Amino acid sequence: KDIEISASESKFILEALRQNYRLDGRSFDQFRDVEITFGKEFGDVSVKMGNTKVHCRISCQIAQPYEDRPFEGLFVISTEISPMAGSQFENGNITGEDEVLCSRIIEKSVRRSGALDVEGLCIVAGSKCWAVRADVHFLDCDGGFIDASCIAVMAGLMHFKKPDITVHGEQIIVHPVNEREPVPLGILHIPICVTFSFFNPQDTEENIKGETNSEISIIDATLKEELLRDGVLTVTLNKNREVVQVSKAGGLPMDALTLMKCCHEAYSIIEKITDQILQLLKEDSEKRNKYAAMLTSEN
Template structure:
């Protein structure tokens, strides 16, 4: 983070002792994730707000026509921009690209672009000359842990919700049609990666300041800010509903044995299935509401004639 955060010895002792008893300060079980609240913009395609416990963020997808990379003439572009300002938490500094922002951008870029979740070839207009460039802007409005998980969910929801303008190609000329002229076109999403973060605590680290036995290690899911300050190791599993393991990112000194890794991957799969189905239902309802508004608008226009 941008600024050092202090946590009192009493707070640290309380949190760690509670975790030993299987208790968390917000009432969740050790392996229980927070339930996100997803809000889709009724007016703008690709604008999504996520409430992940007390963590809040907004994601905006935009598109423009640019020239592709020379070594990838048939692929469109996809970029991610993150902004964590002091508005989200006083612990972040304004105008500085923190380690958190770099880590989030890299993990989501790997999860989406490198796994081909967004079909970049479908963004090609004229090979080697014109392609769609898709940009995801992530703005964190409040911070209480879970930045990676909430950001990944927000970006994937926004990408599925977004629709780019339809175009016509006449030689070298490209005509971009307004939404009134033609229906916008959805992006080609091949699969939906979901990031699930686990954190590890060493029960013996507080009193003796030593690494405890591997069998005593405590693992929890979806840390709050307070828990993130005290954890001894992290593991981010990116997986989709198709049971495809996309990436594993581990940091911290504590080891993870194969049995625990398999168990955590199974739990991550259940969360990915639940979140994917939730987003699918929300998008379906949003589409139905838009069709109702469109039909009502057309009916009013006919009656006014």
């Protein structure tokens, strides 16, 4: 399972960056357009950026908490790749490296960051809590998965609602779904990750001892773009201007002064897209409630 590209094609794109061109039609520092559409279920969404397609799912159920944090509920994200999304991939390799490179990000992007209040999953302390689940599916790759799965999970959390609960010791009263309403969830902050994609037009030494910074960085590598890149970097931020994570794990060497200059441009990008989610969550729920207005008057 190996992608084969000519070195002639390798120089071609490398030339295009040397004349400030890229094959998609975007700018270097331009991001794709995002299509968000929900299914009928809560925590159901289809997210699409041109060629890359994803789908995720949020659910929850009853379990006991750990001994470790006996206060808090349970939550984890599955991101199992299927070779459906591209023939590179093993059947569910949880031990591949790029998978881990997809994993630990979303592990840190959600779980260690804590966008979601796990303490608001405590139904009863130590007895019964929530087990909230996030199964990420990939559909078709043009890269940006780890940015797409960044979004589509956080999209899904802002669309899921959990049903109604009443406690009497052991008499724990999960109510019928349609009499007593499902209840949405508590998001502390909304993180958005950004892939950065790096291209030395030169050898090693002109990056190493060539003092002249000459390295091109772009956003959202397409599939062919992604196969030649030299370093890998993802930052994540919010609306309140705090930096969630940064991960440059090796690759090409890279100036620090670039990275701050990189990460500022992230901010203006992610903010506009964030609010686009925020209206569509409202507007769909508005469309839910206008169709709820088109239901009770109908019934």
